[PDB]
């Protein structure tokens, strides 16, 4: 859920989802219209695409457990939805970290109605 996702994001990037990523570019916090503004925005695109393969779940409200062994995020659940959502969050947390050097503060609050390209799908 939002709790664990934020925990991962904070641990990987040093930034809090709000307000650093909740409205970033065209895809962070939600969005289907692109193109992505940069690598960070693409991480979010991938994250929503991930959540989209979880129709039987509630990604933002279903809690889950995870630990960190040898520095890596390890999703501890076997329970279907919990394990899947966790893998989706781990992926975005690490992606944002990998692309942290291009994070642009001018994109933090990018208007969503300024995103008028095609639907990226994934």
Curated annotation (Swiss-Prot):
Main location: secreted
Keywords: Disulfide bond, Secreted
Record's GO cellular component terms: extracellular region
Protein activity control: Suramin inhibits the myotoxic activity.
GO-annotated biological processes: arachidonate secretion; lipid catabolic process; negative regulation of T cell proliferation; phospholipid metabolic process
Covalent S-S links between cysteines: 26-115, 28-44, 43-95, 49-122, 50-88, 57-81, 75-86
Gene3D superfamilies to which the protein is assigned, alphabetical: Phospholipase A2 domain (1.20.90.10)
Pfam families according to UniProt: Phospholip_A2_1 (PF00068)
UniProt key word Secreted: yes
Subcellular locations according to the entry: Secreted
Superkingdom classification of source: Eukaryota
Region (Important for membrane-damaging activities in eukaryotes and bacteria): 105-117
Entry comment describing in which tissues the protein is expressed: Expressed by the venom gland.
SUPFAM superfamilies: Phospholipase A2, PLA2
MF terms (GO), sorted A to Z: calcium ion binding; calcium-dependent phospholipase A2 activity; phospholipid binding
Role: Snake venom phospholipase A2 homolog that lacks enzymatic activity. Shows high myotoxin activities and displays edema-inducing activities.
Family to which the UniProt record says this protein belongs: Belongs to the phospholipase A2 family. Group II subfamily. S49 sub-subfamily.
Protein name: Basic phospholipase A2 homolog ecarpholin S
Species this protein is from: Echis carinatus
